[PDB]
């Protein structure tokens, strides 16, 4: 997260870290056994780390649970990034508590101009690299469909939306992929892609979670 702030320990209790001997993506806890992340975050042998703040120090509220199943959307395309969503099933159910909690799915799609909370452990610089120990947060608005498409001609599908600041300086970045965009207490987006980070006229691009709610519930019911 570039241009954000230190969230505060366990203030985003649905935020998880996906770990392969290092943090590589975020994710969102949607019930005690399932996490939503980005399809491009898929890898075998993932450990899900819940209750984290400082990802490099054991602070006492963590649960580390292996992924037992990873289910990428059937129509994911790694070239276009269309349908960039994955569901991870935990080998055992997380113990839900004040620091490990689910985020609700949407009942409708969000609107342009709605301020959302984006979070993660990704890069905090728009040029170069600085990776935080603790979770970072950013408030950013959903952009209009027309502004999103203007920013990325030919690349925005009906399964994506833009959020952020066209002047630059405030955005998600590498290491934030798969993590949440929460608006009005619902999970509306998944960090997906952008051109650079926090660049002028290059807002963040997010998977539009409201298009997938039936698929998510059906996948959970059958796996």
């Amino acid at each position: 997260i570039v241009g954000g702030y230190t969230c505060g320990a366990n203030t985003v209790p649905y935020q998880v870290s996906l770990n392969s001997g290092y943090h590589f993506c975020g994710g969102s806890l949607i019930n005690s056994q399932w996490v939503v992340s980005a399809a491009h975050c898929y890898k075998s042998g993932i450990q899900v780390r819940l209750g984290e703040d400082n990802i490099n120090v054991v602070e006492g509220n963590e649960q580390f649970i292996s992924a037992s199943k990873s289910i990428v959307h059937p129509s994911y395309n790694s070239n276009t990034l269309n349908n960039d969503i994955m569901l991870i099933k935990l080998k055992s159910a997380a113990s839900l508590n004040s620091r490990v909690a689910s985020i609700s799915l949407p009942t409708s799609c969000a609107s342009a101009g709605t301020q959302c909370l984006i979070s993660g452990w990704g890069n905090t610089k728009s040029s170069g690299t600085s990776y935080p120990d603790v979770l970072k947060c950013l408030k950013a608005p959903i952009l209009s469909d027309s502004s999103c498409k203007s920013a990325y001609p030919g690349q925005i599908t009906s399964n994506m939306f833009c959020a952020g600041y066209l002047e630059g300086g405030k955005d998600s970045c590498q290491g934030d992929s798969g993590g949440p965009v929460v608006c009005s207490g619902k999970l509306q987006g998944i960090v997906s892609w952008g051109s650079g980070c926090a660049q002028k006229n290059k807002p963040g691009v997010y998977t539009k979670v409201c298009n997938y709610v039936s698929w998510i519930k059906q996948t959970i019911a059958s796996n």
């Binding site: 290092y22 943090h23 590589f24 993506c25 980005a38 491009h40 975050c41 890898k43 276009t80 990034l81 452990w121 990704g122 890069n123 990776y131 690349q155 998600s172 970045c173 590498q174 290491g175 934030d176 992929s177 798969g178 960090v191 997906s192 892609w193 952008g194 051109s195 650079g196 980070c197 963040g204």
Partner: peptide, 12 residues
């Protein structure tokens, strides 16, 4: 299109 995995999408 640059995905937002750490350290990068291409680096893995």
């Amino acid at each position: 299109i640059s995905t937002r995995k750490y350290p990068s999408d291409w680096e893995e």
